[PDB]
Design a protein around this ligand. Structure first.
Ligand SMILES: [Cl-]
Ligand SMILES: [Cl-]
Ligand SMILES: [Cl-]
Ligand SMILES: [Cl-]
Ligand SMILES: [Cl-]
Ligand SMILES: [Cl-]
Lengths: 156, 156, 156, 156, 156, 156
């Protein structure tokens, strides 16, 4: 399947997500990077969103709570081009029973090949890339072509 | 947490999904039950929906290909109250690598307690119930309250 | 592989299962549906079973505790035709470490295409279908034919 | 919870299972160790058992095909005390989609602390141990007590 | 792919691992089997290691804490031949969020076909096999040959 | 637990990994970014590394085949501080059965908070950041302290 060269916009649509024991960490990261982040459009799952607004006076579009459908809302937005950078701080050691599934989100982000930070150090590289504030070129694999060939083969 | 009651409408919004080797089975099921399904609003992932339009001339709202984000569109729509019945025929023996993930959709259908058929016989019971064509009462567990309080104790 | 038309009995063999935080919910559901349920034969995992007997004076065959083998006993019973309706209320948000695996049970129920309720609203549709108290027709996929063709190919 | 001691019998009840690409390996292992295995009671999933009967003239109790419920029959029998050794040769590289799930069987073997060989070399150590042909002592953790008390605090 | 006959050493390199609620159990097992275990070289994840040294005066090489990379250190050691017996007592009912993943470790042990105990009764058979203190023969599947044929096919 | 600061070096130790159907993509990416990658120390799983040596004459340290233990070698090296950037191009649609597990590597990269690219566009942001070629500060959560205290309360 084909690899296409696609141009991406200067102003980004950034989804901000954190597992519960990473919420204060995300808050702090956002707080040191306010100047750059305030040039882009920002979204968050419900509770992280409230925290940002409440502790920073930040302007963010709030989706539903991650475990109550907010994770699928943001995944759908990725697939519709309405989010194009994912920042997801997650708990690799003691995650809550309800803490949002990292897999499905990173998967749909990989399908659409968008920038993803799943470590805080990755987010620091992302936010300081010249590509953050500029137009840039990305390679989109033609997964639709691949998928349909396979489906037709099975179905006949 | 509290359990509270919601009355659901007579006319349903029904999501139809099939794993690749179950596509023809779901087509045969829809074809045999058209009189009843034609009273309702029908939705489907990309390829299953085209197949229904082509083979049956059925008026179905087509979403993206399931593996390319249609699954998450449908999950988002369940959480938003835009879908209130899920019919998903799946492959329990030989699923393809890309076959739509059953767990995440049944998870979100269960959070919002909507009727779900993940076997063909379950589907025959659903469509024959008098509640298919009438309003009925569902119990909605107050997951937002519990969740909010747990998140609080962690972030605190 | 072939799809066979198979007739199923008027009197059902119903397995009743609940994750810990759904046990009181299952109790209440059973309590509003006693009249219909008392026409069929009923089974439960060990602790749910005891609860039903203790809080309702219900007659139910008790298997082992779900996490100590009761889940496999009921799956085996499905595969031997000794259970033919599954009612499983489960915890989509805060499940216990030991709470019975939903996947394996829904899988073997799909192999044998029996009616399954994994939401309480699904159970209300099931119990009110005319098929609940009548003989009905079901489609059994010939999974055995499919499996053996595949196995022989690998083994030579 | 309490740990208590159970004496196990000299004559074992042994479940033999192999993933499709390991079927010939298990046949060669059984064939090389017949003198010892012939002293014990032998059980197998559907296709592995037929193969042993055909190729070696071995008296093996055949269960259902593993992917069609034989795995759960065997898990139920472990929990019931009807199987007390599990020999399972599995494919760690290229398993088929239907290949029997390793986790659920080792889970239940561990709950009931029975000897388990999930590598061929482990099997050579098991069958050569003097405990293969004698009675021995096993520690059984009182999982029912702990479980019961946890379920109680939740339902309460 | 080929099955090769490979000779293994009399003196073993044993990795000792326990989930948190099995740590005291592993301690006790080691304490009844000190005489045999002291003939071989012993390794453990960080915290289990400390416990053994602290409660038994045992000489063991300590890797990092299992959840902080110790599990991958031991898996790498298996793949490099530096560990050739795995003893892993694990929690089948109430595992901690951080408790070491059993799957990846048993998988790499199966790739390299080494003796594995994942039940305490299995460990008692292992430690009493004459093969424990002797040279023995093992069958190594040529997984490398298989893998490369597959990779070349995809990549072209 | 405490969050503390570590300064990372100008010269990076970079692990390069690709699922089989992404091997050619990673080769094209490395080829386009050679000027920058040649300033750093490069590591790769077995087959990806040979391909880079063959096609680009690149000096890469080759580890074992990913599915035969190279993945765990790399995870061990991350935990040991021997790798401080992970570039992993993976197949979100049609992964092979043996394709390297994404979760375990991103888990350990997150424990030790190193920069991670699991999409090609993330990789273009990483390599263009001024932090690629300078020293930078990372936050290391004190996971060993928390873990140690939790293990203690359990064993106690
Ligand atoms: Cl992080
Ligand atoms: Cl079905
Ligand atoms: Cl429900
Ligand atoms: Cl093996
Ligand atoms: Cl055990
Ligand atoms: Cl990508």
């Amino acid at each position: 399947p084909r690899r296409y060269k696609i141009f991406m916009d200067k102003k980004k649509r950034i989804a901000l997500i954190a597992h519960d024991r990473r919420k204060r960490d995300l808050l702090e990261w956002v707080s040191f990077n306010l100047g750059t982040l305030s040039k882009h459009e920002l979204y968050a799952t419900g509770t992280t969103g409230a925290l940002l607004q409440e502790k920073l006076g930040l302007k963010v579009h709030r989706l539903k709570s991650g475990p109550l459908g907010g994770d699928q809302q943001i995944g759908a937005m990725i697939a519709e081009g309405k989010i194009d950078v994912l920042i997801f701080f997650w708990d690799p050691l003691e995650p809550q029973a309800h803490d949002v599934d990292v897999k499905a989100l990173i998967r749909i982000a990989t399908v659409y090949n968008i920038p993803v930070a799943i470590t805080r150090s990755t987010a620091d590289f992302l936010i300081s890339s010249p590509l953050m504030n500029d137009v840039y070129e990305k390679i989109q694999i033609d997964y639709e072509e691949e998928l349909e060939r396979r489906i037709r083969k099975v179905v006949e």
